[PDB]
Design an enzyme around this catalytic site. Structure first.
Site, PDB file in Angstrom:
ATOM      1  N   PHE A   1     -24.910   0.790  32.229  1.00 40.16           N
ATOM      2  CA  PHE A   1     -23.997   0.224  31.206  1.00 40.16           C
ATOM      3  C   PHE A   1     -23.288  -1.105  31.605  1.00 40.16           C
ATOM      4  CE2 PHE A   1     -19.415   1.966  32.238  1.00 40.16           C
ATOM      5  CZ  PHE A   1     -19.732   2.701  33.382  1.00 40.16           C
ATOM      6  N   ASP A   2     -23.038  -1.377  32.907  1.00 35.56           N
ATOM      7  CA  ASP A   2     -22.230  -2.554  33.304  1.00 35.56           C
ATOM      8  C   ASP A   2     -22.487  -3.087  34.745  1.00 35.56           C
ATOM      9  OD1 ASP A   2     -18.800  -0.834  33.428  1.00 35.56           O
ATOM     10  OD2 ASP A   2     -20.757  -0.235  34.422  1.00 35.56           O
TER      11      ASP A   2
ATOM     12  N   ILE B   1      -9.561   2.033  36.335  1.00 33.65           N
ATOM     13  CA  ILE B   1      -9.547   3.505  36.266  1.00 33.65           C
ATOM     14  C   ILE B   1      -8.826   4.045  37.531  1.00 33.65           C
ATOM     15  CG2 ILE B   1     -11.412   3.960  34.610  1.00 33.65           C
ATOM     16  CD1 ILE B   1     -13.428   4.330  36.953  1.00 33.65           C
TER      17      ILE B   1
ATOM     18  N   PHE C   1     -20.300   4.000  40.158  1.00 34.34           N
ATOM     19  CA  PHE C   1     -20.112   2.510  40.363  1.00 34.34           C
ATOM     20  C   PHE C   1     -20.440   2.069  41.830  1.00 34.34           C
ATOM     21  CE2 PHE C   1     -17.686   1.417  36.310  1.00 34.34           C
ATOM     22  CZ  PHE C   1     -17.011   2.618  36.104  1.00 34.34           C
TER      23      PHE C   1
ATOM     24  N   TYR D   1     -13.272   7.892  32.357  1.00 31.87           N
ATOM     25  CA  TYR D   1     -13.320   7.797  30.848  1.00 31.87           C
ATOM     26  C   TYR D   1     -13.222   9.195  30.101  1.00 31.87           C
ATOM     27  CZ  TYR D   1     -15.359   3.084  32.262  1.00 31.87           C
ATOM     28  OH  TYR D   1     -15.636   1.882  32.853  1.00 31.87           O
TER      29      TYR D   1
ATOM     30  N   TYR E   1     -18.564  -5.140  41.089  1.00 30.49           N
ATOM     31  CA  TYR E   1     -19.146  -3.788  40.828  1.00 30.49           C
ATOM     32  C   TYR E   1     -20.549  -3.846  40.093  1.00 30.49           C
ATOM     33  CZ  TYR E   1     -17.687  -3.556  35.764  1.00 30.49           C
ATOM     34  OH  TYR E   1     -17.467  -3.674  34.420  1.00 30.49           O
TER      35      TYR E   1
END
Length: 118
Positions: free
Chosen positions: A46-47, A66, A109, A92, A36
């Site tokens: 963020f990731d 998730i 994502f 989240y 991802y």
């Protein structure tokens, strides 16, 4: 290619770029070797799993990820490439991601799925 969840109406949905080679999709509780990239709604990265030495990997819908990944990854083929658009009820919202995410922010994502039941 879109958004919404076909049961709650809010949840997730996903933009197609490169559709699959092996036409099959993963079953509930099967092992998937994903990778991802991910952003918040303001366009903030963020990731991204490749940067931390290797790819991503989970067991479909086991607490591990998730609920937005169990819906959109159940709809993903062998070798496929797309971008997930997720809403906090499936992600989240009732928790928050530990370093900076609050309980009401939209999520993003870009997923490349390599293989699962194989």
């Amino acid at each position: 290619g879109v958004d919404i969840s076909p049961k709650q109406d809010e949840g997730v949905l996903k933009v197609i770029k490169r559709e699959g080679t092996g036409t099959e999709t993963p079953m509930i509780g099967d092992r998937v070797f994903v990778h991802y990239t991910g952003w918040l709604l303001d366009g903030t990265k963020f990731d991204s799993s490749l940067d931390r030495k290797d790819k991503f990997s989970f067991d479909l819908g086991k607490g591990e990820v998730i609920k937005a990944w169990d819906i959109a990854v159940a709809t993903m083929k062998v070798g496929e490439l797309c971008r997930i658009t997720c809403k906090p009820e499936y992600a989240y919202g009732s928790a928050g991601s530990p370093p900076k995410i609050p309980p009401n922010a939209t999520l993003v994502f870009e997923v490349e799925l390599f293989e699962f039941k194989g």
